[PDB]
Amino acid sequence: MSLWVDKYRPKSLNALSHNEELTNFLKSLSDQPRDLPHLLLYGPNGTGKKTRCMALLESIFGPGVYRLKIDVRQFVTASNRKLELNVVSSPYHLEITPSDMGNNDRIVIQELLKEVAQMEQVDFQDSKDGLAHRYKCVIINEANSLTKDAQAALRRTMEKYSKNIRLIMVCDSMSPIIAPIKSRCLLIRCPAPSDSEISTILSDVVTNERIQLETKDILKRIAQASNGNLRVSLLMLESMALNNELALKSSSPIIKPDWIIVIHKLTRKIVKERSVNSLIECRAVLYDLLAHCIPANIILKELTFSLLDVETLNTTNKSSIIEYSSVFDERLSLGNKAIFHLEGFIAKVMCCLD
Amino acid sequence: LQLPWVEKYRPQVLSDIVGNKETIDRLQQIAKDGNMPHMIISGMPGIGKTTSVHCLAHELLGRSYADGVLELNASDDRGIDVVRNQIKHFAQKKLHLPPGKHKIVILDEADSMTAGAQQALRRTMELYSNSTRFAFACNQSNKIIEPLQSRCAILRYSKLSDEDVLKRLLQIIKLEDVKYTNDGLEAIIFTAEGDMRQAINNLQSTVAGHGLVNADNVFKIVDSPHPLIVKKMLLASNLEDSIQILRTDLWKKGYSSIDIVTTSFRVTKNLAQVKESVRLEMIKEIGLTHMRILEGVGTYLQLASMLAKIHKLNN
Amino acid sequence: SKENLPWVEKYRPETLDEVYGQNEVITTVRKFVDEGKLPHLLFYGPPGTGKTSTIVALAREIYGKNYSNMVLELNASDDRGIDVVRNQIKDFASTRQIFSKGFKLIILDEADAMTNAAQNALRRVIERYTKNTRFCVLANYAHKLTPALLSRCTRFRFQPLPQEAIERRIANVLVHEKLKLSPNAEKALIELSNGDMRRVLNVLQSCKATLDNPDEDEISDDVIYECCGAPRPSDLKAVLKSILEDDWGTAHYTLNKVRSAKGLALIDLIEGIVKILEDYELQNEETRVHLLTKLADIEYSISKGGNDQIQGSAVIGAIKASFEN
Amino acid sequence: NNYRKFGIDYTFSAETIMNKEILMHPRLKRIKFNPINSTLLKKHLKFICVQNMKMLKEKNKWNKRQEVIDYIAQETGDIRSAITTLQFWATSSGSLPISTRESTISYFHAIGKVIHGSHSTNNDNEMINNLFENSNNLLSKEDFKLGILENYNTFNKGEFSISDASSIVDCLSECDNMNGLPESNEYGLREVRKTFRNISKQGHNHGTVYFPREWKVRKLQNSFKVQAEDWL
DNA sequence: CGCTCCTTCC
DNA sequence: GGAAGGAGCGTTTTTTTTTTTTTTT
Ligand SMILES: Nc1ncnc2c1ncn2[C@@H]1O[C@H](COP(=O)(O)OP(=O)(O)OP(O)(O)=S)[C@@H](O)[C@H]1O
Ligand SMILES: Nc1ncnc2c1ncn2[C@@H]1O[C@H](COP(=O)(O)OP(=O)(O)OP(O)(O)=S)[C@@H](O)[C@H]1O
Ligand SMILES: Nc1ncnc2c1ncn2[C@@H]1O[C@H](COP(=O)(O)OP(=O)(O)O)[C@@H](O)[C@H]1O
Ligand SMILES: [Mg+2]
Ligand SMILES: [Mg+2]
């Protein structure tokens, strides 16, 4: 069947079970949705932002928002480069991820979204006389990944055509969002669930799946290992249950993403040996990680925080590590090729440790 | 109307060309001998490359210059089709010339020729070298593809010395009956920076402006070359001196910040006195300032900060 | 029709006598046309110094009032690729005059926007047809021009407008309009002009608009500052004094009050303070280095937006640390 | 007039003219030629001079033939260019600076020059200036910085201090943030050359130079994207 | 340009 | 039996706009 992440996905505002204040605020937003402003939900990845957006859409329109189909929209660049984008559509709303088009994301904003904003939605009234108009809802996934040009192109589209369109953007951090876009949106903070709420959800799933649990401490350990990511918590719960014949025990290992263990091994190697050859081996590991399309900034963050957890290191080493991490994160943001900056960070760490 | 002196006094014969004495003597030898090979002429602007090639062709072909010379430059169509048809037909033409004389194809500014046309020229040169010879003129000899360079004798022109510029300037003054002073000619030569076209243009401008070519009269219109000012600014031992030069001599005179930074990079590339580490650090600072200027912050404050960073590098 | 035009275009010089601040260049070109020996020209200079006006006036003087028939003008708003150079410019330069009116004129305004290929193609066009045609190039950035093109042209530098020329032009505008300007207002206008006549004319038009009764009201420096929203010299002096003498809290409060009084922008205050400090007598040279570097960094950061209060605190701290040396 | 950044517009070679299928076809044999070495070129120039002994002796240049031949053989591996230069020198009664056609250096040759330096030139600034003047196409391309980054460890087979490697990589990272300006490339190459010269010693054994592996990573990323789309 | 295995030359 | 000299190695390749050439029509 479907993965437990999607199997037990809440489908309504009243079905939510953590961050009750956010649920109440969302319900207040849906009281009079006629004048609903553009929304920008920001929060840690995997906390349930898309789920809450879908719940709000369901409250405004109904369960039909969850009936989703996929279409392919074709775009042509100036150089005639033909490419395609996936548009997820429901009878009441549309879903797009322009960042999938990289530097061409702006085209998606200039051609597709604008057109959607320009075409007023009207329909014959079933009972009353005359047409009826309803604004279209559009969701922009990974808003923080948009290039500055696409964000600039969004401005007048949001303003002029507010009657026909209402945007709901979702992001993990607002730092890459340009100030004009933040000015045009209602900002909604989405806190991560606490360990207790994650454990409660996992225990509910366990009860539903008839999985024998030795003690509830296993769920707490899984929640701790997930670092507040409920999706990861559910995925590891399913993996552990399947690998243990649906009978979890305190001795059952906790499965973590493979790249995370790889980064931990890289950190251990960096701490142990510091030399040019060690740096070349670390570069090989970094290139292997990048081959799997892991973002460079995520790699840098994971490596930095893995290094900071090493007990043998002292305060000065950790301070130098965080300094270098900040500098090279800025370099990555302003750079073109990530390998230079990751290798430079590792070299600086090796110099400071030795 | 009266032509400008640059075009009015363009030499007609090789004997009137000054500078690169060995090169001009070799060209005269070729002209009086006849067996001209494929040749490439490279050098900086305004030193006589076009004049030298045209004079050589004229002297070689005599009355047959009209029917024995095919001239093409960047202002004409010079694509692959032109090589396929016009140059090919000219090279195929059977022309009766004095013994040791050949048809000449002058390709001025040959560096700008497209890759396809240059590749096509290989077969033309291979097939029609018996009766046709090619004289390429360019500023960067490396911009001609190696297969073509392999068939040609290279000839690099050096920048003209002050002595030859003064000699030809005196000849022009004698022809024009221009009143002058020694300091004025020295100022003209200093401002010319080895480019004789600029020297003649500045001499004509000064003669018109006041009639008498004095240093003060020369500097009223012509300005000292800004690269030297930039070098003086960079080599100043005190930050205050560098800032004063930047303000008075460059900024207050209307020089744009982008021009200033580009000239600073070019000058720093050739600073022999400075050490390599200091030079590369200065290049880095200049590049950072250039990046800031390109983004739109072309302010005097940014140039002052660049100078301060360079002075820090010196210390 | 001229009344409806903006002052920047309404007061465009029509004759070479109306171009001020370029006495040497103007005299040279006037005498060149008098002797009919115009060479290929290059006019290099910063914005709003009179290059386009000067060249158009020279064309008018040469060809009277029918210059449009024998002058080919091209600028950045037109396409000027290599094909254009090969066909249009070449055909115009290689054709006879309309009525044998001496030589033809080709004006390439804003030639620094042309491509390298087009400039390279222009060399032999300029050289071959010098007898029948003369070229005029105008530029603000010389680094965009190829060395050959620079070598082919006689160079003339348009300096930033001197104060006296600006005063004479302002007097002409004031007599034209029914406007009165105070000496302090004129001094402030010249100071903020930075040698650009366009800025002077635009600010004067805005000041006239600001007057409730321009028929009798006189423009004061306060009117100029209001129209431009720029800081007064007193505000800059007070801010610098507070930064260099008072404590952090007092300096922060003073900066906030001075900015909130008239909604001043931080970049304007930074520029004014930099100008003031450029004349300061510093006994320690490292102070100048730190001031320049930190203030340039703050200006660059401001150019990209950011947090205004943090930037102001950064300016205060940078000045204090620099002067603590 | 080109302003195009395709493979063929940068280099005219078998790889850019042919494709992988043709080159790797079992029925196609490829043989690579090298520049003519000094021995053969000297022999052939000597033969040509001997054939023209009468005129050379008459013009008095015969006695100096060797002095130029060894120069020409030392300057180029192009037989046609060498013969043309010899003819030009001989036919000239005066004295001129003998010169042949310029020869571009290969990618690995440029990497070696940047890392270890040049035997002929002892001044690093002159070498860098000449390299940029005559090899701008190769140096400007973004793969040269990758090659430097992936091959700087070959020095002494990676037996130098981690500080020098850190300095080199930090400089490359800073250059990557300069929007591809010429100053960035100049700064990077100069930093690498100066760092390697500061530690140059007679008793050093160097490693093998290799091409950067970025293209493999790009291919793996494309395969991953296809698989991810299939899963989606 | 440096390392690595093959002749060539005296 | 030592040099010195030389060969083979060390490789692959789209993308933003803007401009330009080429080819077929
Ligand atoms: N050596 C020289 N002797 C006398 N006059 C010279 C000399 N070099 C340049 N001139 C003058 O400058 C004019 C232009 O000379 P050219 O030979 O066309 O310049 P150039 O060397 O071809 O520069 P480029 O490459 O075309 S920009 C001539 O007509 C002369 O008036
Ligand atoms: N020397 C001057 N004398 C009088 N008015 C001037 C002068 N220079 C500029 N102006 C005024 O400013 C306006 C613009 O002058 P322009 O000559 O077009 O500027 P510019 O020198 O061409 O600067 P660029 O290069 O086009 S930005 C003119 O119409 C005049 O009103
Ligand atoms: N209140 C909740 N109760 C149960 N599961 C939840 C709740 N909120 C979120 N989840 C789970 O979290 C998972 C990921 O949430 P999602 O909205 O994709 O995170 P993101 O904010 O990164 O988009 C979903 O599969 C969903 O089942
Ligand atoms: Mg020429
Ligand atoms: Mg203008």
Whether residue D143 lies within 8 A of chain A, CB to CB, comes out as: no
Whose CA is closest to D80, among B240, A260, A137, B125? Answer: B125
Domain end call among B189, B224, B259: B224
Q: Which residues of D touch B110 (CB under 8 A)?
A: none
User: Are B19 and B108 in the same domain?
Assistant: yes
Output the furthest CA–CA distance in chain D (Å, rounded): 86
Long-range contacts of C255-262 (CB under 8 A, 24+ apart): C255/C312, C255/C316, C256/C312, C258/C231, C259/C312, C261/C235, C262/C225, C262/C229, C262/C231, C262/C235
Within this chain, do residues B3 and B147 fall inside the same structural domain, yes or no?
yes
Count interface pairs A-D at CB distance under 8 A: 79
The radius of gyration of chain D's CA atoms, rounded to the nearest angstrom, is 23
Rounded to whole angstroms, the Cα distance separating A340 from A333 reads: 12
Resolution at which this structure was determined, Å: 2.2
User: Which residues have Cβ atoms closer than 7 angstroms to strand E?
Assistant: D 39, 105-106, 108-109, 112-113, 116-120, 204-206, 208-209
- Are B241 and B130 in the same domain? no
Q: D190 and B283 in contact by Cβ < 8 A?
A: yes
Residue D15 CA to residue D21 CA, distance in Å, equals 11
DSSP C95: S
Find the ligand nearest to B3 CA.
1
DSSP reduced 3-state for A122: strand
Do residues B199 and B187 touch, judged by C-beta distance below 8 A?
A: no
Give residue C212's identity as a one-letter amino acid code.
D
Annotate chain D with three-state secondary structure. Answer: CCCCCCHHHHCCCHHHHCCHHHHCCCCCCCCCCCCCCHHHHHHHHHHHHHHCHHHHHHHCHHHHHHHHHHHHHHHCCCHHHHHHHHHHHHHCCCCCCCCCCCCCCCHHHHHHHHHHCCCCCCCHHHHHHHHHHHCHHHHHCHHHHHHHHHHHHHHHHCCCCHHHHHHHHHHHHHHCCCCCCHHHHHHHHHHHHHHHHCCCCCCCCCCCCCCCCHHHHHHHHHHHHHHHHHHC
* CB spacing of B1 vs C102 below 8 angstroms: yes
Residue type, C300: Y
Q: Residue A104 CA to F13 C1' — how many Å? A: 22
Residue pointed to by tokens 């290191």: A313
Give residues (CB < 6 A) around ligand 2: C 8, 11-13, 19-22, 47-53, 140, 169, 197-198, 201
Report which residue type is found at A98: P
Shared-domain flag, residues B14 and B2: yes
Rounded CA separation C219/C211 (Å): 7
For residue D129, report the distance from its CA to the centre of ligand 1, in Å.
Answer: 27
Q: With an 8 Å Cβ cutoff, is C195 touching chain B? A: yes
Residue with tokens 């022809």: B175
D177: nearest CA partner in chain A: A335
Structure tokens at A255: 């499965």
**Residue of A336, A337, A347 lying closest to D169 (CB–CB):** A347
Closest CA–CA distance from residue D74 to any residue of chain B (Å): 16
Q: What angle do the packed helices B257-268 and B226-235 form, to 10 degrees?
A: 70
- With b for 16 or more beta-carbon neighbours within 10 A and e for fewer, the B36-66 pattern comes to bbbbbbbbbbbbbbbbbbbbbbbbbbeeeee
Amino acid at A351: C
Structure-token pair, residue A66? 């969850």
Which residues are CB-neighbours of B123 under 8 A, at least 6 positions away?
none
Q: Straight-line distance from CA D207 to C1' E4, in Å?
A: 11
- C13: which 2 tokens? 């010089």
Give C280→chain B minimum CA distance, Å. 12
Q: How far is the CA of D211 from the C1' of F9 (A)?
A: 12
Interface check for D193 against chain A (CB to CB < 8 A): the answer is no
**φ/ψ of residue A95, rounded to 5:** -130, 130
Instruction: Say yes or no: C96 contacts chain B, CB-CB below 8 A.
Output: no
Give the integer Cα–Cα distance in Å for B88 and B74.
Answer: 18
Nearest nucleotide to B81 (CA to C1') is F22
Cα gap A161→A60, rounded to integer Å: 20
User: For strand C154-157 and strand C41-44, is the pairing parallel, antiparallel, or unpaired?
Assistant: parallel
State the DSSP code for C247: -
DSSP state of A84: E
Q: How close is the Cα of B80 to the center of ligand 1, in Å? A: 29
How many helices (H) and strands (E) chain A has is answered by: 15, 11
Question: Which residue's CA is nearest to the C1' of nucleotide F7?
Answer: D34
CB atoms within 10 A of CB D181: 17
- Cα gap A308→A321, rounded to integer Å: 8
Residues B102 and B43 in one domain: yes
Looking at chain B from residue 9 to 48, which residues have their Cβ under 8 Å from any Cβ of chain C? 44-46
- Cβ partners under 8 Å of residue B152, min gap 6: B37, B38, B39, B40, B134, B136, D84, D101
Which residues in chain D precede a discontinuity of more than 2.5 Å between C and N?
none
Instruction: Tell me the residues of chain D between 131 and 150 that have a Cβ less than 8 Å away from chain B.
Output: 133-134
- Closest atom, ligand 1, to C-alpha of C152: 27
Rg (CA), chain C: 25
| Closest-lying nucleotide for D127 based on CA to C1' | E1
Span CA (B117) to C1' (F25), Å: 23
Which nucleotide is closest, CA of B113 to its C1'? F21
Cβ separation A331–D173 shorter than 8 A: yes
Whether residues B313 and B256 fall in one domain: yes
User: Are residues D68 and D89 in contact, defined by beta-carbon separation less than 8 angstroms?
Assistant: yes
- Contact B154/D at CB under 8 A: yes
What structural domains does chain A harbor?
4-189 (3.40.50.300), 195-248 (1.10.8.60), 258-353 (1.20.272.10)
Are B22 and D72 in contact, with CB atoms under 8 Å apart?
Answer: no
CB-based contact, B154 to chain C, within 8 Å: no
Instruction: Tell me which residue has its CA closest to atom 9 in ligand 2.
Output: C50
Distance C110 CA to ligand 5 centre (A): 7
Q: Which domain-ending residue is among B119, B138, B160?
A: B160
Tell me if B6 is assigned to a ligand binding site. yes
Beta bridge partners of B103: B132
Q: Which nucleotide is closest, CA of D110 to its C1'?
A: E1
Nearest nucleotide by C1' position to the D111 CA atom: E1
Domain residues for B209? 161-224
Same domain? B156 vs B275: no
Which residues, at least 6 apart from A90, have a Cβ–Cβ distance to it below 8 Å? A64, A65, A66, A67, A68, A69
Q: What angle do CA C232, C237, C242 make, to 5 degrees?
A: 130
C199 min Cα distance to partner chain B (Å): 16
Q: Which atom of ligand 3 is nearest to the CA of A45?
A: 22
Cα of C160 vs centre of ligand 2, distance in Å, is 11
Q: How far from chain centre, in Å, is Cα A128?
A: 43
CA distance B33 to D28: 50
Do B151 and B166 fall within a single domain? no
* Three-state secondary structure readout of chain B: CCCCHHHHCCCCCHHHCCCCHHHHHHHHHHHHHCCCCCEEEECCCCCCHHHHHHHHHHHHHHHHHHHHEEEECCCCCCCHHHHHHHHHHHHHCCCCCCCCCCEEEEEECHHHCCHHHHHHHHHHHHHCCCCEEEEEEECCHHHCCHHHHCCCEEEECCCCCHHHHHHHHHHHHHHHCCCECHHHHHHHHHHHCCCHHHHHHHHHHHHHHHCCECHHHHHHHCCCCHHHHHHHHHHCCCHHHHHHHHHHHHHCCCCCHHHHHHHHHHHHCCCCCCCHHHHHHHHHHHHHHHHHHHHCCCCHHHHHHHHHHHHHHHC
Distance CA C265, CA C242 (A): 18
What is the number of the ligand closest to the CA of A16? 3
Nucleotides in chain E near protein beta carbons (<7 Å): 1-4, 9
Q: Domain tally for chain B?
A: 3
The CA distance from B153 to B133, in Å, is 11
* Ligand 1 atom with the shortest distance to the CA of B6: 31
- Ligand nearest to the CA of residue A198, numbered in listed order: 3
Using CB atoms, which residue from B37, B276, B288 is nearest to D124?
Answer: B276
CB atoms < 10 A from the CB of B11, how many? 15
**By the 8 A CB rule, do D135 and D104 touch?**
yes
- Are B273 and B176 in a shared domain? no
Cβ neighbours of residue B25 closer than 8 Å, sequence gap 6 or more: D94
Q: Which of A291, A343, A350 sits opposite D149 (nearest CB)?
A: A343
Question: Ligand 3: residues within 6 Å at CB?
Answer: A 5-6, 8-10, 16-18, 45-51, 201, 230-231
Please report the DSSP string for A247-280 in residue order.
EE-TTSPPP--HHHHHHHHHHHHHHH--SHHHHH
| Nearest chain B Cα distance for residue C305, angstroms | 13
Considering the domain architecture, whether residues B141 and B28 belong to the same structural domain is answered as: yes
Q: Is B302 on the interface with D (CB under 8 A)?
A: no
Q: How far apart are CA C190 and CA C221, in angstroms?
A: 11
Q: Are residues B81 and B142 in the same domain?
A: yes
Tell me the three state secondary structure of residue A313: coil
Asked whether B73 and B108 are in contact (CB, 8 A), the reply is yes
Runs of H (alpha helix) within chain C: 7-10, 23-35, 51-63, 67-70, 82-84, 90-93, 116-128, 147-152, 163-176, 183-193, 197-210, 221-228, 233-245, 248-262, 266-278, 285-303, 308-324
Q: How far is A106 from chain D (nearest CA, A)?
A: 21
Residue C151: name the closest of A166, B201, D108 by CA: B201
Q: Which long-range contacts (CB under 8 A, 24 or more apart) does A60-68 make?
A: A60/A30, A60/A33, A60/A36, A60/A92, A60/A137, A61/A92, A61/A93, A62/A92, A63/A11, A64/A90, A64/A91, A64/A92, A65/A90, A65/A91, A65/A92, A65/A93, A66/A11, A66/A90, A67/A91, A68/A95
Please tell me the distance between residue B142's alpha carbon and the centre of ligand 4 in angstroms.
17
